[PDB]
Amino acid sequence: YSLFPNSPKWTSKVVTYRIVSYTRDLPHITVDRLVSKALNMWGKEIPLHFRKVVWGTADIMIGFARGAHGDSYPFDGPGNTLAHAFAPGTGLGGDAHFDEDERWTDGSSLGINFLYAATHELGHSLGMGHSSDPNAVMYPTYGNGDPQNFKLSQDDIKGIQKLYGK
Numbered sequence: 830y831s832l833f834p835n836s837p838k839w840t841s842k843v844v845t846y847r848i849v850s851y852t853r854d855l856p857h858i859t860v861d862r863l864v865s866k867a868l869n870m871w872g873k874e875i876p877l878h879f880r881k882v883v884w885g886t887a888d889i890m891i892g893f894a895r896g897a898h899g900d901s902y903p904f905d906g907p908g909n910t911l912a913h914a915f916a917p918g919t920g921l922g923g924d925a926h927f928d929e930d931e932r933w934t935d936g937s938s939l940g941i942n943f944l945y946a947a948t949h950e951l952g953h954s955l956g957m958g959h960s961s962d963p964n965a966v967m968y969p970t971y972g973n974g975d976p977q978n979f980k981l982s983q984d985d986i987k988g989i990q991k992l993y994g995k
């Protein structure tokens with residue numbers, strides 16, 4: 830595993846998150862449930878708790894967007910980069926954006942599995958860097974394992990716990 834330079838991490842006991850925009854590909858409630866699942870996958874391993882807010886600023890702002898969308902990291906259309914996120918910090922720090930040009934799915938159809946992508950992106954929101962282990966969720970490419978049957982690997986758990994304790 831790897832962490833960001835200077836090991837940025839949240840210092841608060843609770844981290845807030847807000848889903849600012851949704852994808853037309855999935856019901857809103859599915860995205861809400863999948864984001865909660867992704868966050869608790871990492872949450873189960875560490876001393877951290879999350880709270881969803883529906884207005885204003887939240888630590889972790891989540892949204893879908895296509896092409897250029899403010900942050901100077903424009904999406905590229907279908908394929909290639911699927912989503913991206915930023916290390917803990919203020920503003921853009923900790924946020925996670927998903928490329929709306931991708932066909933998102935909960936796993937019951939063809940497309941990119943939103944739960945797998947969200948677990949990877951929120952790992953960055955929490956301070957995780959990319960891993961060299963093809964089995965880790967933090968590996969940089971999508972599709973090595975099974976997007977519909979996965980769990981954090983020992984490499985991922987080792988990293989998050991090094992960052993926040995057990």
Ligand SMILES: CC(C)C[C@H](CC(=O)NO)C(=O)N[C@H]1Cc2cn(c3ccccc23)CCCCCCNC1=O
Nearest residue numbers: 908909910911912913914946949950953968969970971
């Ligand atoms: C892990 C995922 C949730 C988020 C990551 C990016 C990321 O790590 N965000 O935090 C991602 O999108 N990885 C690309 C990496 C990638 C693979 N190729 C690329 C060609 C061009 C640009 C990028 C890529 C080869 C062709 C296949 C393109 C379609 C699949 N794309 C990927 O696997």
Ligand SMILES: [Ca+2]
Nearest residue numbers: 906908910928
């Ligand atoms: Ca894309």
Ligand SMILES: [Ca+2]
Nearest residue numbers: 888920921922
């Ligand atoms: Ca933020």
Ligand SMILES: [Zn+2]
Nearest residue numbers: 898900902926
């Ligand atoms: Zn962005």
Ligand SMILES: [Zn+2]
Nearest residue numbers: 949953959969
């Ligand atoms: Zn990544």
